[PDB]
């Protein structure tokens, strides 16, 4: 699709068999989701933004469908304000900015 | 790495 | 133009009498610029990021050119590590996400 920006670009995602809403965020290097269980091993990591840093769990090579497009990549899990899809996955689904 | 979410409230 | 998301989507903006690099940020409701001593009346505001809130100065009706496209709107100034173009201005320049 083509998505305009008068509202937050929230989309439905599927991950670990579960549906969630997430924010398409071209200002995020990485993908960060709200606290949840994901299968497999994770590594503790920290990520920063406005307001400073938070602790997250890094899961690698995690499948996620964003709209109906398939991605498999790094998903961080922690106390993000909102589910965020970052560039690492936006690139995988072929997402660009256009003006 | 960095995540520049901004909540305008 | 079309901007790919392999790297941070940074572009040149012109605000007041300055050119700056700024991040095209679909994950930002508002536009937030690194500290600079802009003239004009302002109102205090607090904006939230992944790590918590920060204090900023809200300037209204500020002309700003983004990659040659003229816009005018609310610009927030404060201790952000990166200049951030938010949805408030991305809409004015006809910016979409596409995949």
Task: Tell me the technique behind this structure.
Answer: X-ray
Give the span between the Cα atoms of C9 and A26, in whole angstroms: 7
**Element (H or E) spanning A64, and its range?**
strand A52-66
Neighbour tally for A11: CB within 10 Å: 18
Q: What are phi and psi of A87, to 5 degrees?
A: -55, -35
Q: What does C48-75 look like in DSSP terms, one character per residue?
A: EETTEEEEEEEEEEEEEEETTEEEEEEE
What are the structure tokens assigned to A88, written together? 């690492």
Q: What are phi and psi of A94, to 5 degrees?
A: 85, 30
Give the span between the Cα atoms of A22 and A13, in whole angstroms: 7
| Chain B environment of C86 (Cβ under 8 Å) | 6, 8
Cβ(A53)–Cβ(A32) below 8 Å: no
Give the span between the Cα atoms of A95 and A24, in whole angstroms: 10
Closest CA to A96 of C92, C9, C90, C83: C9
Instruction: Return the bridge partners of A56, or none.
Output: A45
Question: How many residues are there in chain A?
Answer: 99
Give the span between the Cα atoms of A83 and C90, in whole angstroms: 21
Chain B closest-CA separation from residue A93 CA (Å): 19
Compute, in degrees rounded to 10, the torsion defined by CA atoms A69, A34, A46, C56.
Answer: 100
Q: Which residue has the tokens 């933004």?
A: A49
Q: Which domain holds residue A49?
A: 1-99
Q: What are phi and psi of C13, to 5 degrees?
A: -120, 160
Please give the tally of structural domains in chain C.
1
| Chain C environment of B1 (Cβ under 8 Å) | none
| Chain B environment of C27 (Cβ under 8 Å) | 3-6
List the CATH number of the domain containing C84: 2.40.70.10
Neighbour tally for C92: CB within 10 Å: 17
Which strand ranges, in their side-by-side order, compose the sheet holding A96-98? A2-3, C96-98, A96-98, C2-3
Give the span between the Cα atoms of C71 and A10, in whole angstroms: 24
Chain A positions contacting chain B at CB under 8 Å are 23, 25, 27-30, 32, 47-50, 80-82, 84, 86
Residues in contact with C33: Cβ distance below 8 Å, sequence separation at least 6, in sequence order: C15, C20, C22, C75, C76, C77, C80, C83, C84
């Amino acid at each position: 699709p083509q998505i305009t920006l008068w509202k937050r670009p929230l989309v439905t995602i599927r991950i670990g068999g579960q549906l969630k809403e997430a924010l398409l965020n071209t200002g995020a290097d990485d993908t960060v989701l709200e606290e949840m269980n994901l299968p497999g091993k994770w590594k503790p990591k920290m990520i920063g933004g406005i307001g400073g840093f938070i602790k997250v769990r890094q899961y690698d090579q995690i499948p996620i469908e964003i709209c109906g497009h398939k991605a498999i990549g790094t998903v961080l899990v922690g106390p993000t304000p909102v589910n965020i899809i970052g560039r690492n996955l936006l690139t995988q689904i072929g997402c660009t900015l256009n003006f | 790495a960095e995540v520049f979410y901004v909540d305008g409230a």
